[PDB]
């Protein structure tokens, strides 16, 4: 089996979630005790988020971790985060091992479940990530996003509540998704952050739920099992 | 600073705890967003746990995972589990980088807080690990373990209630501890597993609470930050 390499640290919370999904998915797909080899490089988020050289410095760090993972034996690499995907192409040009894009992984799942129009939810940042929305639509989907007012509220909730395990405003998130289902007739929603999955699960809305990080880890494990 | 290497997969559950503490501790010791570089090699537990060559085979897997981390750039390596420490010496021999034993770490923190006599709780295998208890006593400590009757009960609650986040029988464990405080006069308790600390904290008992996994990670991070 191809060894998986994950570049994390781009918020340890996010990497922590990937590992959890990695455990779940494995118990579900293989025999007992079986977990496909996985390597993780958790970078210092401070030297990444607040880099004096912007993305020019971020690409250096990502490529660095990627090469480290290769040196350790990773035959399949991936970013355990969303924004890093803003420079996926640059990093892949220097990585001598195939990389799996979260965007490709999600668009594939979405299209596979038969939906073509979805509501993209996440932090204000992930709901305004032009490259994300644009790259996703070029795959053959129509992505809708809540109004600027609902983004601030949804963002507040994720930061002040979900980040602590408090589901106090769960119902509010459910009405948000049911509104666009009846409003713009979406056929599914995308959870663009690792905090949203704790509040909205498949059997909570009338549409398909796409746990972004979960789908990503499934593709990784899928290709890794080949 | 000194890149941290962790040999994991020796139960992803256990590795998840280590990485969780890593995050927790980093947030306590350093500024926001700051997290010391950490590389995690998660092995296929089935090849480890059910190795046809026994420990001879496990050592090969641990040494290989260590060499992988070394190639990735790890300068400091440690096992993200207890039992693998049964072949710690054998791994260090074949590893060209200093490793940090959980025992040393727990024993140093225990001795630093003044206690000399402690209760060693945890799974049944944890309260019976002759190697663990012995190596801990040679460090200058008095280790005491509950009776078989209390072992099965506690382990049962661990593999059942606690494991599934059910802290209903927390009071039972609390009594057991303060029981030995007056019984054989202990001054602290060690939590060998990663489940127990979920039901027992500081302001809960009269003795000192030692989170075996947490203490191990603080050591790792401290030595990597020097």
TrEMBL record, chains A, B:
InterPro entries: Asp/Glu/hydantoin_racemase, Asp/Glu_race, Asp_race
GO terms assigned for molecular function: amino-acid racemase activity
UniProt keyword Cell inner membrane, yes or no: no
Native source organism of the sequence: Pyrococcus horikoshii (strain ATCC 700860 / DSM 12428 / JCM 9974 / NBRC 100139 / OT-3)
Keyword annotations from UniProtKB, A to Z: Isomerase
Family, as annotated: Belongs to the aspartate/glutamate racemases family.
Annotated SUPFAM superfamilies: Aspartate/glutamate racemase
UniProt feature coiled coil, ranges: none
UniProt cross-references to Pfam families, sorted A to Z: Asp_Glu_race
Name of this protein: 226aa long hypothetical aspartate racemase
């Amino acid at each position: 089996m191809k060894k998986i390499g994950i570049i994390g640290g781009t918020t340890p919370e996010s990497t922590l979630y990937y590992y959890k999904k990695y455990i779940e998915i494995s118990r579900e797909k293989f025999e007992k005790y079986f977990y496909p080899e996985l390597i993780i490089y958790s970078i210092n988020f401070k030297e990444f988020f607040q880099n004096p050289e912007g993305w020019e410095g971020r690409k250096k760090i990502l490529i660095n971790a990627a090469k480290a993972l290769e040196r350790a034996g990773a035959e399949l690499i991936a970013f355990a985060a969303n924004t890093p995907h803003l420079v996926f192409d640059d990093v892949q040009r220097e990585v001598n091992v195939p990389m799996v894009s979260i965007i490709d992984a999600v668009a594939e799942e979405i299209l596979k479940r038969g939906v073509r129009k979805v509501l993209l939810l996440g932090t204000k940042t992930t709901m305004t990530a032009d490259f994300y929305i644009k790259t996703l639509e070029e795959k053959g989907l129509e992505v809708v996003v809540p109004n600027d007012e609902e983004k601030e509220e949804l963002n507040r909730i994720i930061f002040e509540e979900l980040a602590f395990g408090n589901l106090k405003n769960k119902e509010w998130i459910v009405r948000l998704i049911e509104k666009y289902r009846e409003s713009e007739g979406i056929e599914g929603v995308i959870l663009g952050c690792t905090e949203l999955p704790l509040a909205i699960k498949q059997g909570d809305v009338s549409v398909e739920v796409f746990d972004s990080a979960e789908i990503h880890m499934r593709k990784l494990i899928e290709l890794a099992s080949e």
